[PDB]
Ligand binder design. Structure first.
Ligand code: CL
Length: 242
């Protein structure tokens, strides 16, 4: 069952933007969103694709573990935190595109396509360049499709080893305190209109888990902090977090 709550539109409207938040209560098996249509509109996954990419790289042995170091290639890029060595944890934290481009090239078209079908991930279409299709290729995923994928991950039900899923969920760790844990991944899609920001993941509570997936219009990078801030207002409004 699903329920539309357009009162959340205020959180986007008060920040002069537009988007969708989708929540899923795992205990009650109920979904909630401000916009049923946009919740099912498919966009480029951009850096949210680092979740499945990590899973596949780990399960194929492209990545040995979360400690394996991927040395900087010496090419100075505009993101200072990309110009350094990374492991899976930091590559996810700083959303280091060049590291994941190399994963995909070593994964290869054939195995990447097969794995995304096995994950039932979005439209399962890797059309484009193998090292950038999630940035400007044909792959698409909706907010509700992110939920389904993330729920499988939470329950270790994806068609990779338990270890690979446990490692990726560790790398997704974003925030933890006495009240909740957030494991999540941001996304920023600019190469194809409309330009959007993503935030997908879940909130772990003592006795429940709330999966979430949001995207929002992102004409400039100035409003990137709104991906998390808007999501948290909805969570606070719904008394999921203090
Ligand atoms: Cl952990």
């Amino acid at each position: 069952e699903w329920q539309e709550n357009k009162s959340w539109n205020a959180h986007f409207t008060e920040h002069k933007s537009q988007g969708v938040v989708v929540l899923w209560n795992e205990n009650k098996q109920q979904g909630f969103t401000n916009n049923l249509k946009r919740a099912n509109q498919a966009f480029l996954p951009a850096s949210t694709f680092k979740i499945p990419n990590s899973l596949i790289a780990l399960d194929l042995g492209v990545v040995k573990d979360e400690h394996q170091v991927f040395k900087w290639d010496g090419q100075t890029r505009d993101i200072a935190t990309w110009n350094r060595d990374h492991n899976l944890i930091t590559a996810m934290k700083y959303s280091v595109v060049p590291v994941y481009q190399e994963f995909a090239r070593q994964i290869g078209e054939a195995r990447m396509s097969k794995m995304l079908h096995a994950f039932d991930y979005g439209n399962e279409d890797i059309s484009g360049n193998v090292d950038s299709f999630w940035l400007d290729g044909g792959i698409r995923i909706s907010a509700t499709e992110q939920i389904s994928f993330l729920r499988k991950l939470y329950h270790n039900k994806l068609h990779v080893s338990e270890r690979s899923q446990r490692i990726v969920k560790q790398a997704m760790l974003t925030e933890a305190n006495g009240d909740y844990i957030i494991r999540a991944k941001t996304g920023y899609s600019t190469r194809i209109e409309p330009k959007i920001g993503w935030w997908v993941g879940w909130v772990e509570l003592d006795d429940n888990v709330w999966f979430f997936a949001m995207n929002m219009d992102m004409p400039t990078s100035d409003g990137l902090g709104l991906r998390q801030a808007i999501t948290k207002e909805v969570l606070k409004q719904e008394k999921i977090i203090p």
